[PDB]
Every structure is written in structure tokens, then in C-alpha cells.
Amino acid sequence: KISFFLPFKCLPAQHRKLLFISFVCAVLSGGTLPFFISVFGVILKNINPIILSLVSIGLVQFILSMISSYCMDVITSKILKTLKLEYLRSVFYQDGQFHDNNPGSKLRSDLDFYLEQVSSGIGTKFITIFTYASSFLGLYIWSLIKNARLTLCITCVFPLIYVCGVICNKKVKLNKKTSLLYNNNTMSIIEEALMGIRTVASYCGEKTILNKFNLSETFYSKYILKANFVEALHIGLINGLILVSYAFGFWYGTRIIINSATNQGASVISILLGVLISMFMLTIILPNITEYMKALEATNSLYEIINRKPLVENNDDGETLPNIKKIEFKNVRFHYDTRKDVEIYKDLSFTLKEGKTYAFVGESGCGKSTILKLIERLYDPTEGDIIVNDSHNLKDINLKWWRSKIGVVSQDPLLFSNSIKNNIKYSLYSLKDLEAMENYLEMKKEYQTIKDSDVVDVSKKVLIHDFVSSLPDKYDTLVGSNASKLSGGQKQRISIARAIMRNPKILILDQATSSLDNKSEYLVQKTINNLKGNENRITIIIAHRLSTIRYANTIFVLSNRNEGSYIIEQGTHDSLMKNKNGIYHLMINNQKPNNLRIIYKEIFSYKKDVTIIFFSILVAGGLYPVFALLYARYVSTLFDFANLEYNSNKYSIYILLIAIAMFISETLKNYYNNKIGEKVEKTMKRRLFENILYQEMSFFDQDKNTPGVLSAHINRDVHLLKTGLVNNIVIFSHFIMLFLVSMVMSFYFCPIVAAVLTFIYFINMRVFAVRAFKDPSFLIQEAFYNMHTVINYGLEDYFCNLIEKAIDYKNKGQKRRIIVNAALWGFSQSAQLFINSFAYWFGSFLIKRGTILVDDFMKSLFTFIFTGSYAGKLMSLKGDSENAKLSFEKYYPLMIRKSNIDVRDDGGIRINKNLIKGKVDIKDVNFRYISRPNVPIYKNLSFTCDSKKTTAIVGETGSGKSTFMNLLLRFYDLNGEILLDDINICDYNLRDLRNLFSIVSQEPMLFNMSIYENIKFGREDATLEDVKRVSKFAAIDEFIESLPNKYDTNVGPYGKSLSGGQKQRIAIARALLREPKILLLDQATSSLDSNSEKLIEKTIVDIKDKADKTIITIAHRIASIKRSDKIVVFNNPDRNGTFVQSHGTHDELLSAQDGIYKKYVKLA
Ligand SMILES: Nc1ncnc2c1ncn2[C@@H]1O[C@H](COP(=O)(O)OP(=O)(O)OP(=O)(O)O)[C@@H](O)[C@H]1O
Ligand SMILES: Nc1ncnc2c1ncn2[C@@H]1O[C@H](COP(=O)(O)OP(=O)(O)OP(=O)(O)O)[C@@H](O)[C@H]1O
Ligand SMILES: [Mg+2]
Ligand SMILES: [Mg+2]
């Protein structure tokens, strides 16, 4: 065993008393039915006071049962809050090795899988057990005092039912665990598809994903259906065993009758009829024990994750030094966990003092960013040490205080999606929390102390104050998901400002000036190298353009030329190039309302599946009241002896025949339920995702249709249907069949009372049917995608407290919807006696009149007890049925919506890839975004690229360079024209338009498949030989052939298990395999050293030496621009638009008229 009361362990003393009250106020309400029997039996056989007593005990039953339902639904939605908060707080404090093996899409699935079990095992189903177990003892203890030997045969049977459960549970968890893995698999395909929709749409790979989705769901439905078969057999078998035992009891009971009535109604019949009700209660109890025993394992598995202990603990056991000096590596080694057989470092060691600048240079696979991550203690070394100030090791200093001084600008900027000033002010929270919380909550209030004076000047210091002051909502406008609204240089400037604001002692810049022109870079560098406090700090620059590090106290050069990188040179700018003919000299010489009808229509189509369940419900529903015959026709044939033994042997065999029919009906009722529900779930899951995957780009720029929201809709609110909407109907049908059989059985005795009270039961049945700060999922996904920023700037408790205010905001009807359900639950348990009292009332008159007898009245009233007692099951699945309908109503329009720009339209000019000139002409252009329609960008653009020529485009940051590309691929429609071979782009049947282009985007992206499949994206029919051929021009087919599982190696999610230079060359290779007619490049050499850069340049100029390809490029390095044919300059003198100024300079007209190009040539 594990335990019993785990979910109720971590509670305060304010809810434990509520638990005690809810426990005690149910046993009382349960022990009134046998008390009612004991009173009614003695009072019937002998007017106002008795009716008043009956109504009074009914009322106190109502009042006692109303409280237990209110004081139980309050604990449920506090446990379900506490667990979910404790889960995702010991995920932020976990080390980095935990995040490599456990992707973010694997955690959400487990979370919202186990919480469903916990919710469906501690709700209203917890109290029905205890309130129907009291009625068991009330009738079992009564029947025991009279004759115990007749009754104590089932206690010998209790051990046998305990054995089926063990095996029938052991044969379940295997399949459930095997299905959870494929669930985790198919959840990692949705997020990666929605984040990279711009690439999927461009390469037409939105059909390859559907096949993976369908395979992963097909291997899932099989195992889940195989698992939920055993559970339909277990409960179907227990009923049969119980009825067989009852048959043995009846057989033993007839023995004393045949003895006495021969050798010398009846009380024995009464005893057996009292025993029957106990078994009828066990029929209701047992199918809720399992669902409670499923929750213990789930919450155990959750506490297993919550009580994890990582290697790098963020305790408060560290130290606090005065100041920072002399970081020092000493014989460091390191390797990663996935690739245990791939070493990186040989003998890494150096020293760094304060008040100086430093630099790192090398190839694109060495260890630079790995050092960046190794300083901040995301990871730990294996053999060396990072001793600080020659008397203290880094594994003994307080991590919070150490991170309270470092400013970071990473190789991939990661901003949140609220606003600019809040993103810039987030740097200070981790310092104010140190000021307040370590003095004497004083934290949540001092965040207002941060005034709007430092934001202004720190924005002035990065040349963004002018642009941010021109648009509406200066410091209040919001940025989209991953800051998709802004541009690259803008995000770099925002991150630099966020780093400067806190005045760090240590600063680490990792390719921060990659997407910025020469002039702004020079000005920003002049600003940073004279900032206040520069007399004592340590700045660490990493760069590929060696012009920015001309001044530096030391320059470290390192290489790996095949078992580990190492340093080869040390010296300044002047004392390094003139010394020898090393690598550095070569480098510097190189540079120089009625919607639910859609569901039922799908249910009433599997015609042979709805038939069997119907004929099984018809048999399992009414076979308890049919026993009423078996006694009557038996008791009618007691005083006709000399043939009694024949009947006695006959009716026991009839009971056996009924027992063997209970089994089949129950198990076929319980299995085909889930079989029908899963098949609705699959279709409703597929259609939504399929429709969403073909929509346009503006649909994804909206505020609410974010990637973290849609996945939750799909998974959760398509899974809810199977349970709620398809099980509740089955329950209603079972109840209806009980009622329809009981009303037939009651006419057999006396039709008057039946015709009277069926009306009342119909009315009481009608009551049950007709009675009726953003989201949490946004924040959780937004945190899981940007874990590095959140760990660097110390933002765990902030999001923790911020998600609580959304859980509470979503729960507002959580208070009103409970009292209604509690009143209904009380009315279910108290609607039985109010009717019996009225029956006695209007029966006394007719009995006194002399028209109806007492016996038939009694045994016509007694037979409705089953349908009176079964009403408690009409309240176990109400909330999940309502939530499902609400969710369906608020995701149906996504399912039905259609797109304006759809690739499936197959009508238009079909274009062949044999006769194409490749001329792109522009007549006039005017464009404006919908997110902020006051900012004009383009005004009368005019330029051309003729055919098989090379064209270069230079401009200022924010001018619209990476917007022409998007307009050219039908991401956004137009006022103006763009012509390909003198015909507009809107009339080409864009399946072929997107076939002959090939882009190299500004931020590459990869998926969790292998390299072989990522390079084959789009073009499925291709051999490994073509891949080997095309991976040679990319200058990457040496690293891959030094690696286990060369082309079968699995990259991580989004490409995090590779570097930036590799991720980019792989994208280049992917673009070259398609054999494109038009090649679009956008900063294709931003993260590459000069050697790889000139190799790819050799490939490009070789391709340019021959015809049959039209190339367009964008770059800031002046070196790779002179070899073009025409150079186009964009400008924006007054902030109203852009127009062409220069045209066709080609490095021969650099200063003829006043322009900007004459600066960009000389500044670098
Ligand atoms: N999570 C990971 N698991 C396993 N290996 C990794 C992981 N992240 C990076 N690597 C490997 O570590 C090596 C070093 O990568 P590094 O961070 O030094 O790239 P880089 O030098 O910054 O590249 P660039 O110079 O182009 O920016 C790479 O060869 C890469 O394959
Ligand atoms: N999704 C969007 N919604 C609204 N406006 C946008 C969106 N994307 C870009 N913009 C606007 O377009 C302008 C320029 O965008 P773009 O990214 O094309 O410039 P860029 O030339 O790529 O900049 P860089 O040269 O730094 O990459 C920005 O000022 C921005 O306000
Ligand atoms: Mg890097
Ligand atoms: Mg750009």
C-alpha cells in the first residue's frame, strides 16, 4: 500500500473541521431509510401527528445532507490549487540538466493528466460511498439478529473479490504508461508547428505533420481501449458473484420451509427481501472505490516530482563577499549529458581582473556560449574549478547574490509580451527583493518605487528614445508573442537597455551588435565604453566582426585543430597581427446555441455500436424488480405441498440464469461507452487542428489566439467530451429503464396508486435536467519558452504570485454554482419520504372507504424503492458536462472559420519550373500594419531586379527590409503592385509560387526530428546521396561525420541542442536542396566566422558564374556587397515613409551625391 488520506494531508486547521462536519453529516442522512422502514412497518398495521413526524424527519434529512455537499466542494478547489502551484515552483529551481531531458511539452501533459484523475476521484463521489455504506449496515445488522447463519455466507466470499482487483489493476498501469508516452509525443508536434508557422507555410510542409499526428493518435487509441476493457469486466463480474451467493442463500433458506411446513407468507421472505436491498446498495458503492484508488497513485506521482532534489541547489546557505575580483579557471573539463562521448575542452584556464575589457575569438563550434552558461552556474564542471578572488569557490557562494550583479545579452534575445517599460524595469525586482525581504510582505509595494526617470535616460543611451517617442503609447504599447511586432535591432537595443539599468559589476555581451549598422554600432560602443562606474567592472565581449574589439587589454584566440578546443594566442591588437603569420593575421587580412447538434449527429451514425449498448442497458436496468415475480409465484405455491422440492430447485436455477446475464450486460454496457466516446474525440481533435493549420498570418498576430492557448483548448476541451457528455447520457438511460420497468410491475398489483405517483416521479425527474488578469496557460507557456531569462534575472516568485491572481479570477461563479448543486443533492436524498407520506395519506381514506385492501397497496408501494434510491447517481457528472458545453461553445468558431489566403484553392495560372525569367518589378507601394494603423512605412517604392543578377539592399534599422520578403510570399496582402514577369502575384495559384522561392530567414528554426528529416523538409522523395552532396556547399559535412548517428542524430526541441552557426548552415543546406529558381537571403552570415563565410561566398559566386538562378541578399557587412551588380538604399528623413535614393552604386559610386553609403564604406 501507499496510504489513504494523502490529498487531505497539507491543509490548515480551518478546512479539517469542515471535513469532519461533511463526514459526520452524511452518516446521519444515510441512517434514515431503515429508520423510516422500522417506523412505517409498525404504523401501517395499526392522522396529522404521524404525517408531521414524517415530514419533519424528511426536513432534517434535507438540512443535514445540504451541508456535506457545500463543505466538500470548497476543499476540492483548494487542493487542486495547492497541487498546481507547488508543482510549477519546483520546476524553476531545477538545474539545467533537468531541462535537457524533460522538455516543456512533457510536463504540461503529465500535469493536466494527473489533475483530471484527482478531480474525478475526490468530488461528489467521496461522500456517496459513506452515505450509502450506512444504509448497508442499517439493513444488514437488522437481518443479522433474527438469523445470522443464513446471512454469514457472503463474508466467506469477501476475500475472493479482493483477488480480481489485484490482477485487473496490474494489467492496466502498463498500458496507461505506454499511452502517456505517445500523448507526450503528439503534444510536442502542435507547439513546434504553431511557433514555426512562417516556415511551414513557406515550404509547404503542412501535410507531413498530419501523418505524424495521426500515427501517434492511432498507436494511442489502441492501447487506451485495451486498458479500459478490463475495468468493464471487473465490475461486471462482481455483480454476478454477488447474485450467485444470493442464490445459494435462497436455496439454503427454502430448506427450513420444506422441513417445517411438511413435518409440522412467512418471515423468511421478509428477511431475504431485506437482504436484497443491501446488495442493491453494494451495486452503487463499488464503482466509485476504483476511481478513488486511481487518485492515490496520481497524487503520489505528483509529490514525487514536487519532492525532487537537484544537484545545484538554490538554498540560502551561501556567502556574501564585499566585492568581486579575480575570476580564475584552473584545468576545466566539461561534456554534455546526451552526448557522453563528445569532449569539448582540453586544458581551459585563464585569469580576469577588474577595470578591463576582454574578447573571445574562434570557430563556430568551440565553447564560447558554453563558457557563458558555465560562469552563471547553470551547469558545473567535471574536474576543474572557478575559484573567485583566490580564496572562495563558486560552489560555495550564494547564487542569488552572485546573480544580483551580472548583466547578460544573449545570442538569442527573449522578451515577454506585456510592454516595454515593464520589461525594462524587471531588472530591478531581484534587487529590491534583496533590500526588503532580508531586512524584516514588503516586496509587492516597493515595486512602485521604481520611477520612470531611469527608463528615459537609459533609452536615450541606446538611440531608441527617438523612435519610441514618435509612435502612440510611447512606453505603454505592447509587443506580441516573442516580440514578433518589433524588429531585430530594436529587440537588441531593448535587451541592452535592460542590462544597463541595474549597473552590473559584470557584463557579458554575446553577439549583441549583429543586426546593427556601422554608425549606430560605433555610437553605442562609444556610449558603453564611457559609462559611469566603468573604473571598476568586467565586460566580456564576444564577436565575429573583429573591428569592434580593436581596443582591448587582451584577446583570447582558441581552436580545435579533434578531441578538444584550446587557446593558442594571447595579446593585444597591435602585438598579435605583426608577430607571426598565424590565424589572426589571416583573419584581419580577410576582412581588412444549438451547436451541440453537431455532436449527436456523429453519435447516431455507428449503428451497430449504439444497438448492442441499448439491448444491454435494457437487460441490466430491469432485472432487480423482476425478482418481485419470483417471490410472488413462489409464495402462491407454498400450501400445495408434495411437489415443493421441484419448485425450490427450479427457482434457484432461474436465479443462476439471471446471474449469468447480469455479467454480459454490464461489461458490454461499460466497454462500448468508452469505445463510442474515443471515436468522437479523435475526429473533433483532428478537424480543429487541421483547420487552424491553414489560416493566415494576421490570425496569429491577434492577442488571444496565442500558441499557449490553442493547445490547451485542443487537448483538454476535446478530452472532456468522452467522460462527461457520453457517460451522463448512459446514466440517464439506465435510470429511465428502471422507472419504465417499475411502472409496469406496479400495475400488476394495483394500478390506481401507480397512475397517481408516476406523475409525481415524472415531475421530480424533470427537475434534474432543466436547471442549468489573463489565462493561466498563457503565462505557463510564456515562462517555459523563456526559462533562461527567468533564471538570469530572478523571476520565479513573481510569476508564481502572478498566476494565483488568474486562478482566482477564473473562479467567480465557483461560489454560486455550489449551493445549487447542494440543494439538488439534498432534494435527491429527501424526495423519497415526502412521497411515501403523501401515499399513506391518500391511501388511508380509500382503505377506510372500503375499496382497496392493505396488502396490495403495501406491495405496490414497496417496489418503487429501487428507482427512488438510484437517484443519487444523477448528480455525479454535472459540472464536467457543463464545462464541456461551455468550452465547445467557445472553440466551435475556430473549427468552422475559413481563411482569406488558402493554399488549398486549386484555381489560377499554373507555372512551370522550366521557362522562367525571374524579373521582379515594383510600380508603387503603400503599406500599413493593422496592429497600429498610424505608422506609415513605405511611400512610392521603385526598383527592379532584372534576371539572373545579384541585388543588394542596405538601409537603416526599422526601414522595412524584412517586410518586402513577407509581402513577396503572401503573408500579407496589399495599394500598389508587385509584378513577377509583368503579372501580379495575386493570380498565380500560390502552391507553385511558394515552390520556386527559397528563403533563409533572419531567425532559423528546427524541429525535434533528426537532421536527415529536417533537411528533407518539404521534399520527401530524396536519397541520402543528395543530402551528402548539398551538405558540402554548406561547409558542414565534417562535423556531422565526426558524430555518433551521423545523419540519424536527434536535435533538441527548437534546435536548442545545437549552436547558432550550425543551425544556420543546416538551413542553408535545406534551402539549396530544393533546386530553387529564386534565392532570398536575409543575414545569412551573421553568426559565421570568416573562414566558413568565405567558403559559402565561394559557393555563391560559383553559382553566380553560371545562369539559371536569381539571387537577392540583405547584409550589413560592406565586404560582401561590392561584388553585387546593383545596390539599393532606403532612407527615412522625416518619419512618414521610405523611398529610394541611390541605385546601382556597385562600389564605384560611393560618394557622388550626399548619402549615407559613403559613411558605411569608411566606418568599417
Ligand atoms: N544541450 C546540449 N546538449 C549537447 N550538446 C550541446 C548542447 N548545446 C550545445 N551543445 C554542443 O556544444 C558545442 C559547443 O557549442 P557552443 O555553445 O560553443 O556554440 P558557439 O561556439 O557559441 O557557436 P557560435 O560560435 O556559432 O555561436 C556544439 O558543438 C554543440 O553541438
Ligand atoms: N507584426 C507586426 N505588426 C505591426 N508592425 C510591425 C510588425 N512587424 C514589423 N512591424 C513594423 O515594421 C517596421 C520595420 O520592420 P522590419 O522588421 O521589416 O525592419 P527591418 O529592416 O527588418 O529591421 P532590421 O534591419 O533591424 O532587421 C518596424 O518599425 C515595426 O514597427
Ligand atoms: Mg553561440
Ligand atoms: Mg531583420
From Swiss-Prot:
Q: Where does ATP 1 bind?
A: Y336, T338, R339, S364, C366, G367, K368, S369, T370, Q411, L1058, S1059, G1061, Q1062
Task: List the keywords (alphabetical).
Answer: ATP-binding, Hydrolase, Magnesium, Membrane, Metal-binding, Nucleotide-binding, Translocase, Transmembrane, Transmembrane helix, Transport, Vacuole
Subcellular location, principal:
membrane
How this chain sits in the membrane, per its record, is: Multi-pass membrane protein
The observed outcome of changing K173Q is:
Significantly increases ATPase activity
Return the annotated site residues (Important for mefloquine and halofantrine binding).
Answer: F280
Q: Which residues lie on this side of the membrane: Cytoplasmic?
A: 68-124, 169-231, 287-609, 672-728, 771-826, 873-1164
Q: Where are the transmembrane segments?
A: 23-43, 47-67, 125-145, 148-168, 232-252, 266-286, 610-630, 651-671, 729-749, 750-770, 827-847, 852-872
Q: What class of enzyme is it?
A: translocase
Q: Which residues form the ABC transporter domain?
A: 327-561, 920-1162
Q: Which residues form a coiled coil?
A: none
CDD domains referenced in this protein's UniProt entry, alphabetically:
ABC_6TM_Pgp_ABCB1_D1_like, ABC_6TM_Pgp_ABCB1_D2_like, ABC_MTABC3_MDL1_MDL2
Vacuolar side residue ranges read 146-147, 253-265, 631-650, 848-851
Q: Which GO terms describe its molecular function?
A: ABC-type transporter activity; ATP binding; ATP hydrolysis activity; ATPase-coupled transmembrane transporter activity; metal ion binding
Q: Pull one GO CC term from this UniProt entry.
A: membrane
Q: Its Enzyme Commission number?
A: 7.6.2.2
Query: Reported effect of changing D992Y?
Result: Decreases ATPase activity
**SUPFAM superfamilies documented for this protein:** ABC transporter transmembrane region, P-loop containing nucleoside triphosphate hydrolases
Please write the reaction equations for the catalytic activity of this protein: ATP + H2O + xenobioticSide 1 = ADP + phosphate + xenobioticSide 2
The Swiss-Prot or TrEMBL record describes its family as follows: Belongs to the ABC transporter superfamily. ABCB family. Multidrug resistance exporter (TC 3.A.1.201) subfamily.
Its UniProt miscellaneous note says: Can transport human ABCB1 substrates rhodamine B and vinblastine. Does not transport amantadine.
Q: What name does UniProt use for this protein?
A: Multidrug resistance protein 1
Q: Which organism is it from?
A: Plasmodium falciparum (isolate 3D7)
